[PDB]
């Protein structure tokens, strides 16, 4: 080691050459996923290709509590308030989450 | 440190002058030091406080600070390929006002006076002093001439006072 340089801390002391993952299949993966999406759309026609409806939820922690995103599924209390039976909601394209609490 | 003490090889440098030891005259403490004054560093072997390192003994510097008992002196020191302006503090007993620039102000005043006179009379002059140059020719009055000849050799006179 010589000169004024940042102290090196490369993590290359194992057989790292045997655990290298390349991305030469990125376009192929994109093509495969698009083909799967097209097949699923053809299968579920005329159901929407975007999938089942999802709830609106807040971001976790103080860094993201001002943000709104998509949750896993509607709560049982939300379904009861809306008048949709929980056993029927999944069959008509509504995601159901029996864990989410309404505070 | 590193094989040599602070005062190593100062037997003669830091000793006082012959028949000049003892009490220090009051003129040493009755001197005035100001910023920018040139001072010579002369270590007094009897004053062990504020003693400069032996290197600065016998060197001239400029005053940059004035404390109650000491003065700051800026001394040039050659270290390899450059000169460092090292700043030290030295008690007034170890320092003496330098005479390295005694005639500068006098010369400037005389140059200004001469330039003023030249301008008054309408002339251009140079006040620069010049090195001693060749002298002109002159006549020397003839006097009695004494002849010098090589001395015949005598081995008896080879010793101081004779053998």
């Amino acid at each position: 080691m010589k000169h004024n340089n940042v102290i090196p801390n490369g993590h290359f002391k194992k057989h790292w050459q045997n655990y290298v993952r390349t991305w030469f299949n990125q376009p192929a993966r994109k093509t495969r996923r698009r083909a799967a999406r097209q097949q699923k759309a053809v299968k579920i026609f005329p159901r929407p290709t975007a999938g089942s409806l999802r709830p609106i939820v807040h971001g976790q922690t103080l860094k993201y509590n001002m943000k709104v995103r998509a949750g896993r599924g509607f709560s049982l209390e939300e379904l009861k308030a809306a008048g949709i039976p929980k056993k029927l909601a999944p069959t008509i394209g509504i995601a159901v989450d029996h864990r989410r609490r309404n505070r | 440190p590193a094989g040599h003490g602070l005062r190593s090889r100062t037997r003669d440098s830091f000793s006082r002058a012959f028949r000049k030891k003892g009490t220090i005259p009051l003129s040493t403490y009755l001197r005035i030091f100001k910023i920018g004054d040139y001072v010579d560093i002369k270590v007094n072997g009897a004053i062990h406080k504020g003693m400069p390192h032996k290197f600065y003994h016998g060197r001239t510097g400029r005053v940059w600070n004035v404390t109650k008992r000491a003065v700051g002196v800026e001394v040039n020191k050659q270290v390899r390929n450059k000169i460092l302006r090292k700043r030290i503090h030295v008690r007034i007993e170890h320092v003496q006002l330098s005479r390295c620039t005694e005639e500068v102000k006098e010369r400037m005043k005389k140059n200004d006076q001469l330039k003023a006179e030249a301008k008054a009379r309408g002339e251009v002059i140079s006040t620069k002093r010049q090195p001693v140059g060749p002298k002109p020719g002159f006549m020397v009055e003839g006097a009695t001439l004494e002849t010098v000849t090589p001395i015949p050799y005598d081995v008896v006179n080879d010793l101081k006072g004779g053998y």
Partner: protein, 186 residues
Amino acid sequence: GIDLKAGGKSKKTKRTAPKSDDVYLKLLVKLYRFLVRRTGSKFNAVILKRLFMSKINKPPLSLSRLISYAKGKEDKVVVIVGTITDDVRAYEVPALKVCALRFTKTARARIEKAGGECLTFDQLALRAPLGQNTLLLRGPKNAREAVKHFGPAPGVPHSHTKPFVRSKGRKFERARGRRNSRGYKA
């Protein structure tokens, strides 16, 4: 033999032409070579010399700093061999005549809206061939991150040079040599 250093030849290197391959910059260089040769103008010579300089030697000038320097001289053509960037800290933009190698889109829009003009160096040659009534400006050359790491080493006394560190925090070069409680300070 002759007692000369390197046979009396120079050992200093300076730019004699742009290292860039920009054809427009080459044309500007030709223009100002002609101007320097046939006018002997100090302004033209300075412009020609700066046209050769590298990117870091042509730092940008902020709009707020440009306004501050042009205050009281709005009638003169301000000339910078470099880029002019917008400043969101500047509220009032007066009418200015500005010549530069490039303007950012926001800076150009603000100048045009305020009522000034953005000029190229060919237009500057047409307007002030000898650089008359011009305000020649330079950006901050030493105001970059790399400069902070230059100078005396971080570990020597009286040095405020920034060290090279992969991360910032308590565990990253703060213990020994930086504190009186861990060995020595500085």
